[PDB]
Design a protein around this ligand. Structure first.
Ligand code: 2WL
Length: 175
């Protein structure tokens, strides 16, 4: 019944880079395959004079049960036809020689309480996503207001990721 094709997904109409800048706290996430930030995930977006968006993400990464590292990462975004859909060239500060490259879609946001982000790394033949990740961001790490809660839940379901998100802890672990 539900249309889960990635090309059918709506994103933030008239997305505004300047308003989106500043600190964002990831409170929930749906994982992709492979190694990935685990928790204490804080993103700091910013827009330079020329108007190109970039961001830094810090977070705990599990190497062993015995060993974690606070991985500082950096991202730089490239605009497309759609102002909510970017191409994020990203990397760890140590491994800056080595870089990854993802879709980065701002699915929805109100700029001052919540944001829903999404990325498809691989399509199935039917157009649905085979490997996706999604962050639920918040300006306040104590939670989202009632209207944000309703919207996030609605968007999570429309991305066909209902009940696939997991809550993320914030402990000042990477301060
Ligand atoms: O946890 C990961 C991650 C790490 N990897 C491994 C990796 C592959 C290729 C290069 C560096 C690291 C894959 N996904 N991500 C979550 C954070 N994301 C990111 C990075 C910088 C700014 C903003 C974001 Cl959302 C990058 C993707």
């Amino acid at each position: 019944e539900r249309d889960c094709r990635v090309s059918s997904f709506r994103v933030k109409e008239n997305f505004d880079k300047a308003r989106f800048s500043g600190t964002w706290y990831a409170m929930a996430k749906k994982d992709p395959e492979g190694l990935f930030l685990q928790d204490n995930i804080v993103a700091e977006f910013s827009v330079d004079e020329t108007g190109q968006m970039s961001a830094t993400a810090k977070g705990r990464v599990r190497l062993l049960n015995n060993w974690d590292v606070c991985a500082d990462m950096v991202g730089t975004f490239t605009d497309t036809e759609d102002p909510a859909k970017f191409k994020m060239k990203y990397w760890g500060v140590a491994s800056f020689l080595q870089k990854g490259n993802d879709d980065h879609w701002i699915v929805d946001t109100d700029y001052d309480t919540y944001a829903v982000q999404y990325s498809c790394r691989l399509l199935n033949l039917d157009g649905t996503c085979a490997d996706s990740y999604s962050f639920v961001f918040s300006r306040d790490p104590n939670g989202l207001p009632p209207e944000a809660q309703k919207i996030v839940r609605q968007r999570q379901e429309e991305l066909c990721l209902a009940r696939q998100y997991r809550l993320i802890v914030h402990n000042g672990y990477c301060d």
